[PDB]
Amino acid sequence: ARALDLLRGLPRVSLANLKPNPGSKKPERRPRGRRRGRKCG
């Protein structure tokens, strides 16, 4: 497919260029900093 042709063009897939699907990993909220510290919600 066109996607596989793009793969042939693109650099090699290794363990160094792997990314999660965007939206799957909601960031952790931890109580540090001005906004989330102090009374920590």
């Binding site: 066109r2 793009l6 793969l7 693109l10 650099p11 090699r12 897939v13 160094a16 260029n17």
Partner: protein, 94 residues
Amino acid sequence: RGRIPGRQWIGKHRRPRFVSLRAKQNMIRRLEIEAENHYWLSMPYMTREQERGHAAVRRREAFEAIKAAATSKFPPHRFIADQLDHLNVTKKWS
């Protein structure tokens, strides 16, 4: 020697203030502006019966546009181009 009991500008005993000439003039200026406002609102163009429905089409259409946006809210598309573009982070010369 002369002290106002408690706080100056609150309570039963307050420090008296007096009206200055420029304050009086400021109020008079604003009074003139709003008297002119009275006049220009005192001459109306149409009457209520003559204006009863002259904007219904435009108002309705504007609300329909609002509804169309609020209903067209939806998630965006996703692309092979972006997902495979992330592979360039190891694009080396040689």
